[PDB]
Ligand binder design. Structure first.
Ligand SMILES: CC[C@@H]1C(=O)N(C)c2cnc(Nc3ccc(C(=O)NC4CCN(C)CC4)cc3OC)nc2N1C1CCCC1
Length: 116
């Protein structure tokens, strides 16, 4: 009968995943920053997410009922997967994507261990 994680705590966890080290490229929707990529980018990435959308989702209770924040991890994995796919696995920001995902997953697992 898990009670669920506090929405504001999950939203602050999400906000903390937006790093200057990653040049803030996961902070905002890619098509909001570059509207003319819509056709080309949606062909490679039919699903998108970003940390401003994930923070707003966290405040709606989208992730609060997952015991190990599985839904948030899938949204983080989508962000990193799209970056690797669109830019290329040997691109410089595909390495940033793998580091971001690894950092984010450690911060999520730490949150779950703290709020248990
Ligand atoms: C397909 C595009 C590709 C990609 O995959 N993603 C995800 C992407 C997402 N966002 C961006 N760019 C930025 C988007 C938002 C911000 C931003 O909002 N920063 C804030 C500004 C105000 N400040 C007080 C706080 C930080 C900065 C960005 O770049 C510096 N570029 C992206 N690239 C890059 C293209 C060349 C290789 C990577």
């Amino acid at each position: 009968y898990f009670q669920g994680y506090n929405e504001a705590d999950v939203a602050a966890l999400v906000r903390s995943l937006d790093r200057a080290e990653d040049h803030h490229i996961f902070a905002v929707d890619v098509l909001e920053t570059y509207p003319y990529l819509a056709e080309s980018y949606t062909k490679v990435c039919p699903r998108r997410c970003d940390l401003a959308t994930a923070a707003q989702k966290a405040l709606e209770g989208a992730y609060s009922y997952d015991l190990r924040l599985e839904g948030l991890k899938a949204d983080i994995a989508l962000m990193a997967s799209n970056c690797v796919a669109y830019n290329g696995p040997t691109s410089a920001y595909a390495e940033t994507a793998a580091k971001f995902e690894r950092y984010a997953l450690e911060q999520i697992d730490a949150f779950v261990l703290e709020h248990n």
